[PDB]
Design a protein around this ligand. Structure first.
Ligand SMILES: [Ca+2]
Ligand SMILES: [Ca+2]
Length: 137
């Protein structure tokens, strides 16, 4: 498995800023995107073989609504996740999503579907053997 943090290898780009204002994150902080449709985060990973893997995204959302966003893998839309609010920025949340990966380098992007942008994204964890970070394109 590999746990991908902002500003660590495997992390490519993000809309908005990196921040640490709500305690409870892992690594240095989390991504706080601007409030815009299409706000995104991009990661790059390598997989030893082609199959479906479970990814888990850890996030904060204590805002007034869910912050729906689409998981894109290798330029293909895989699934839209809700990212619900719990009105509690001290309680980080997790959501699991299955993603098809190819052998070799893969891209994963998360893209905001609404004007509230993304939830604050702490990390993405991809489970399974043979997963490592990859260089950014
Ligand atoms: Ca934000
Ligand atoms: Ca983090």
């Amino acid at each position: 498995m590999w746990l991908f943090e902002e500003s660590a290898v495997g992390f490519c780009s993000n809309s908005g800023v990196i921040d640490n204002k709500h305690a409870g994150y892992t690594g240095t902080g989390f991504i706080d995107t601007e409030n815009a449709v299409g706000a995104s985060i991009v990661w790059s990973l390598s997989a030893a073989s082609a199959k479906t893997y479970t990814a888990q995204i850890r996030f904060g959302n204590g805002g007034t609504s869910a912050r729906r966003a689409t998981v894109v893998v290798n330029d293909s839309q895989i699934k839209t996740l809700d990212f619900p609010t719990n009105s509690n920025w001290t309680q980080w949340q997790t959501v699991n999503v299955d993603i098809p990966l190819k052998a070799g380098t893969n891209s994963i992007k998360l893209v905001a579907e609404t004007a509230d942008g993304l939830a604050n994204i702490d990390s993405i964890r991809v489970t399974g053997n043979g997963i490592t970070p990859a260089a950014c394109p």
